[PDB]
Chain A
Amino acid sequence: QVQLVQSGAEVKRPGSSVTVSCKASGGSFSTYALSWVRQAPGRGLEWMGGVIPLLTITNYAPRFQGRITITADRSTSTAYLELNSLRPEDTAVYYCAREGTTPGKPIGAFAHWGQGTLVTVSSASTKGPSVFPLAPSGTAALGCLVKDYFPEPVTVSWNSGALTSGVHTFPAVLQSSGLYSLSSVVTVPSSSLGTQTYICNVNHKPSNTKVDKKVEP
């Protein structure tokens, strides 16, 4: 019944301000508490603050007091988070979350979550990756190195999705340049190297880089 839909990913320069929106459908927007929660890459959840729209009563975590504004527009059932003075440490997925109801009495705890909004704080420009083979030397390993792209994400398949067994696609790492790199590998029978073709399909939508790299011995 209640659905929260957030605005899309954004790249922001250091020192800038970001606004993230959350449009709610279902239930009662004005009388239920809406909070923002963020999660930095590979890290835990952090409650940032919330608002109760009917009352225009905000509640910010002390860590963000002075750097955040949460507002709500009853005419569009939209809540907004503003976070200022951005730094690399603010790179995170930002979630809106609304308290649940009993089977409506509010329960405080967050039953309804938005899909999240990735905010990347960086001075980097959009860049498509170079795709390099990791050539195979009973079992062989081979792969592709997807180097120097921005921003996230990249997707990788093998043989147009026909090859999944034995595939490992690793989380990206953020290089000193501010560009990302990732690798994808597969292990296969050594005997298949003569007869079977292995192609890594790399997709980086922001740069329109769509490479199907044949990896051979």
Chain B
Amino acid sequence: NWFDITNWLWYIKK
């Protein structure tokens, strides 16, 4: 789901 990509980005940039 493309709509979950930014959540993943947020998690990995923390």
Q: How many residues of A contact B (CB 8 A)?
A: 14
A-contacting residues of B (Cβ < 8 Å)?
2-7, 9-10, 13
How far, in angstroms, from A105 to B5 measured CA to CA in the complex? 12
Q: Decide if B9 touches A54 in the complex (CB within 8 Å).
A: yes
B-contacting residues of A (Cβ < 8 Å)?
31-33, 50, 52, 54-55, 57, 59, 99, 104-106, 108
Residues of chain A within 8 A of B13, CB atoms compared? 31
Residues of chain B within 8 A of A32, CB atoms compared? 6
How far, in angstroms, from A117 to B2 measured CA to CA in the complex? 25
Residues of chain A within 8 A of B7, CB atoms compared? 105-106, 108
Residues of chain A within 8 A of B10, CB atoms compared? 31, 104-106
Q: Decide if B9 touches A31 in the complex (CB within 8 Å).
A: yes
How far, in angstroms, from A78 to B13 measured CA to CA in the complex? 22
Residues of chain A within 8 A of B9, CB atoms compared? 31, 52, 54-55
Residues of chain B within 8 A of A31, CB atoms compared? 6, 9-10, 13
Residues of chain B within 8 A of A104, CB atoms compared? 10
Residues of chain A within 8 A of B3, CB atoms compared? 33, 108
Question: Which of chain A's residues has its CB closest to B14's CB?
Answer: A105
Residues of chain B within 8 A of A54, CB atoms compared? 9
Could you tell me the distance in whole angstroms from the C-beta of A36 to the nearest C-beta in chain B?
A: 14
